[PDB]
RNA sequence: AAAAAAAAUUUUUUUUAAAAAAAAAAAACUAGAUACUAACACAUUUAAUUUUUUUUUGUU
């Protein structure tokens, strides 16, 4: 819907299924969202972008990390910059909530690309993964 | 008494050569070309409170 008190009080809304009731709409309409979400953190405004990166969290645990990843991963070849870091903190949260042993190894394998701007979103993904799995991260 | 099958030692000349033990670009000036970095900032902002300034001049 475009505007912003839609799409900032939609978020919420849509991130509260997400932690309360998951079950109800099938796996392919939480993979609506995630690209829906992920074309919506070109705005401007922040409490959006940062409501857009906490409920790539509740759909990954709802559906799985590896159906969102390839579809973040697919979005660091993007050139503009909030676009590679606001997915880069997603891949961190993705991370923390269905653990990091299962991002990882894919996130290790796509820095491999000769395109410097996922190497960088590779490595500021790994950053914010880092902190945000606080005393893990030793393993 | 006279007519048939197996064997060993010591001395001498050379032709189509090679090897490089490992550091380089500049700098300055002036303009142009293109990538990129900071969860950078980008619509809410406004219900106690200091820009509010004049030769004092508002009466039982």
Request: hydrophobic fraction near 45%; include cysteine; charge should be positive.
């Amino acid at each position: 819907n475009k505007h912003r008190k839609v799409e900032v009080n939609t978020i919420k809304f849509v991130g509260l299924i997400g932690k309360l009731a998951p079950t109800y709409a099938p796996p392919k309409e939480w993979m609506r969202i995630c690209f829906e979400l992920l074309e919506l953190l070109k705005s401007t405004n922040k409490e959006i972008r940062r409501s857009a990166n906490a409920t790539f969290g509740f759909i990954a645990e709802a559906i799985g990390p590896h159906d969102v990843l390839v579809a973040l991963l697919n979005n660091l070849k993007v050139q503009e910059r909030q676009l590679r870091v606001c997915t880069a903190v997603a891949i961190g949260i993705v991370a923390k909530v269905c653990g990091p042993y299962n991002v990882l190894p894919v996130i290790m394998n796509e820095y491999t690309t000769p395109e410097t701007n996922v190497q960088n979103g590779v490595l500021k993904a790994m950053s914010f993964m880092f902190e945000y799995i606080g005393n893990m991260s030793k393993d």
